[PDB]
Amino acid sequence: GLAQNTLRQIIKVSLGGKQIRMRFSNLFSDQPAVLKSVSVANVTEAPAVDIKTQKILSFKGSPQVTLGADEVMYSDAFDFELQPGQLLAITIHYGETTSYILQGDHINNESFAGAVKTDSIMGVDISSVK
């Protein structure tokens, strides 16, 4: 269980570009996942990020999205300073490879201090656009 919490995943991008898109797949299956808010930002150290580059994602215009079992869904296209070989952070707040869980909403939390570190949980990946 992890609903009503906030998970921040750190990934390794191998493709740079100006305009990117985010893949979302329900890895953790069974029940659906309600994504209250998603953000993408650059990584400084540890789980700490930088909001001055953070971008909040939208899904068909809506900032929230629900992902049933065996479902994949991409975010809307957003401008981002992506570089080949960079550290990327994706923070997701839910509602009823390193990864960091905090209780409650922590979309605007740089430090993520006091975070745990799990063993993934949700399939994320960068993807091209039109």
Author numbering: 41 to 136, 149 to 171, 175 to 185
Paper text:
Acetyl xylan esterases (AcXE) that target mono- or doubly acetylated Xylp are well characterized; however, the previously studied AcXE from Flavobacterium johnsoniae (FjoAcXE) was the first to remove the acetyl group from 2-O-MeGlcpA-3-O-acetyl-substituted Xylp units, yet structural characteristics of these enzymes remain unspecified. All homologs were confirmed to release acetate from 2-O-MeGlcpA-3-O-acetyl-substituted xylan, and the crystal structures point to key structural elements that might serve as defining features of this unclassified carbohydrate esterase family. Enzymes comprised two domains: N-terminal CBM domain and a C-terminal SGNH domain. In FjoAcXE and all studied homologs, the sequence motif around the catalytic serine is Gly-Asn-Ser-Ile (GNSI), which differs from other SGNH hydrolases.
We successfully solved the structure of the CBM-like domain of FjoAcXE (to resolution 2.45 Å) and multiple structures of the full-length CspAcXE and PbeAcXE enzymes. The construct of FjoAcXE that successfully crystallized did not include the first 36 amino acids that comprise the CBM; residues 37–40 and residues 137–148 were also disordered in the structure. Due to the incomplete FjoAcXE CBM structure, further analysis will focus on the PbeAcXE and CspAcXE structures, although based on our analysis in subsequent sections, we expect that these regions would participate in the active site, i.e., Lys34 and Arg148 of FjoAcXE. The CBM-like domains of FjoAcXE, PbeAcXE and CspAcXE adopted a similar structure. Based on the protein sequence of FjoAcXE, the CBM-like domains do not clearly group with the existing CBM families. CBM-like domains share structural similarity to several types of β-structures, including CBM1 and CBM35.
